């Protein structure tokens, strides 16, 4: 199934995932496309930040859903 | 009796890195703060840097640390903004080519440090990445981002 990841710069990332995919797997797929390391990614769905060890189905994130990406890197 | 502790004023490294990678005093603390408002001191995140470049039709591509540095087409890149640790604490640093010679334009330096050609800065990046806790951002045009021509 496909889900969308929207970034603060207005970009939209399309991902192929499964309900059993963990949030870490989603962050790994974001790393494959964007190069952003998982430990720098903050994924938010419906106003809540998502936990790495939990799965997509645990958060009831279904197909065509839109996740938000916030980056942590500071300097 | 508590502990009195005077601290240095912030370094504004994000602003100096933006300006050094663009070779022009374009951004300021006021521009950075203005950008940081609409995304919701002196410790600006990578979102601010990305938005700052986006306002100029540019973009920051995040380099995958897993890729070999040989796959990085440095000539296609306007410059590099690094995030290095400062002995935690981190700071932003610009690397930029001028007339074919790459320089480490770290705002904490007293003068730019010449790195040489692509091999020299590639060894610099490899030595910076092997140290750990190093993130490499590629400053490129929107066209180079769309084409992915930063990747050789």
From Swiss-Prot, chain A:
UniProt-reported outcome of changing residue 72 to G: No effect on ADP-ribosylation
Domain Ubiquitin-like: residue ranges: 1-75
Membrane topology category: Peripheral membrane protein
Places the protein is found: Cytoplasm; Nucleus; Mitochondrion outer membrane
Cross-link (Glycyl lysine isopeptide (Lys-Gly) (interchain with G-Cter in ubiquitin)): 6, 11, 27, 29, 33, 48, 63
UniProt effect for mutating residue 48 to R: No effect on HLTF-mediated polyubiquitination of PCNA
PTM info: Phosphorylated at Ser-65 by PINK1 during mitophagy. Phosphorylated ubiquitin specifically binds and activates parkin (PRKN), triggering mitophagy. Phosphorylation does not affect E1-mediated E2 charging of ubiquitin but affects discharging of E2 enzymes to form polyubiquitin chains. It also affects deubiquitination by deubiquitinase enzymes such as USP30.
Interacts with activating enzyme, annotated site positions: 54, 72
Domain of life: Eukaryota
Residue numbers of (Microbial infection) ADP-ribosylthreonine PTMs: 66
Name used for this protein in its record: Ubiquitin
Organism of origin: Homo sapiens
Span of the entire protein shown here: 1 to 75 of 229
Swiss-Prot record, chain B:
Protein name as annotated: Josephin-2
One function term, GO molecular function aspect: cysteine-type deubiquitinase activity
UniProt xrefs under Pfam families: Josephin
Catalytic class of the enzyme: hydrolase
Catalytic center residues: 13, 91
SMART domains cross-referenced by the UniProt entry: Josephin
One GO CC term, this protein: cytosol
Cell compartment(s), UniProt: Cytoplasm, Cytosol
Domain of life: Eukaryota
Keywords recorded for this protein, A-Z: Cytoplasm, Hydrolase, Protease, Ubl conjugation pathway
EC number assigned by the record: 3.4.19.12
Presence of keyword Nucleus: no
Residue stretches making up the Josephin domain: 1-152
